[PDB]
């Protein structure tokens, strides 16, 4: 499974039929037809005593992990009952700036957006809570070319460390409270994850106010290749699946 012409999306049902089933991710935000729900608490994002491990190109992005062994990075609150461990972050961007998100606003899309995954600590680990229908917390924001994004620095540096499918590098001190926009307003609704087993666990808070980035840093991601060392190179662009049919289900809003 990939992100090309054989391999792509609209093939995954093959191999995972729950590609359409009936909670499927990403989905167009309606922003005229979602629902301001009076009863949603604050996001609570603690994040002070986040410790970050390494970054990991898997072949279909690159991946910042986090220790979650203990309630270090946690988030709470909004929508959510219980609490939500960071395991890891992820991008998903495009060849071009008039795409790469894979949540759409009005139809808009955005340059790239960033995931933040989180999983139900009364399941104990991952594993198990991906089987969960409130199994796991995905924090989404967009990213628009504008300014340079001081947060996202060290990312962007450490790269050309992990160019090609399988390389990894150490990556500690990495404080992810540098990549959140100024307001915590968001959309909610029930999804699935967005490659590959793509399992009905999630709980989708995609945030209102996206987060600009300058066109050198989002070059920069470009330049990952989805192949192996020694392989041909396959440029990492376009890693976004398309919106998938809401049918029946509600977006609430914060706001
Ligand atoms: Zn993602």
């Given at each position: ?33 979602a629902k301001?729900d ?212 509600q977006?609430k809003?914060?706001?």
């Amino acid at each position: 499974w990939g992100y090309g012409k054989h391999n792509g999306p609209e093939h995954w049902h093959k191999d995972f039929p729950i590609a359409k089933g009936e909670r499927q991710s990403p989905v167009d935000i309606d922003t005229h037809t979602a629902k301001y729900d009076p009863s949603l608490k604050p996001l609570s994002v603690s994040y002070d005593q986040a410790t970050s491990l390494r970054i990991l190109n898997n072949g279909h992005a690159f991946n910042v992990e986090f220790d979650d062994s203990q309630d270090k990075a946690v988030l709470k609150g909004g929508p959510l009952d219980g609490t939500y461990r960071l395991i890891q972050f992820h991008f998903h961007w495009g060849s071009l700036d008039g795409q790469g998100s894979e949540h759409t606003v009005d139809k808009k899309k955005y340059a790239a957006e960033l995931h933040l995954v989180h999983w139900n600590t009364k399941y104990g680990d991952f594993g198990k809570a991906v089987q969960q229908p409130d199994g796991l917390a995905v924090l989404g924001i967009f990213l628009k070319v504008g300014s340079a994004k001081p947060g996202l620095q060290k990312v962007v540096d450490v790269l050309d460390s992990i160019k090609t499918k399988g390389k990894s590098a150490d990556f500690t001190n990495f404080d992810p409270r540098g990549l959140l926009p100024e307001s915590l307003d968001y959309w909610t609704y029930p999804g699935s994850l967005h490659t590959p087993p793509l399992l009905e666990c999630v709980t989708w808070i995609v945030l209102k106010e996206p987060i600009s980035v300058s066109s050198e840093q989002v070059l920069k991601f470009r330049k990952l290749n989805f192949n192996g060392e020694g392989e041909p190179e396959e440029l990492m662009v376009d890693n976004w699946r398309p919106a998938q049919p809401l049918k029946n289900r509600q977006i609430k809003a914060s706001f």
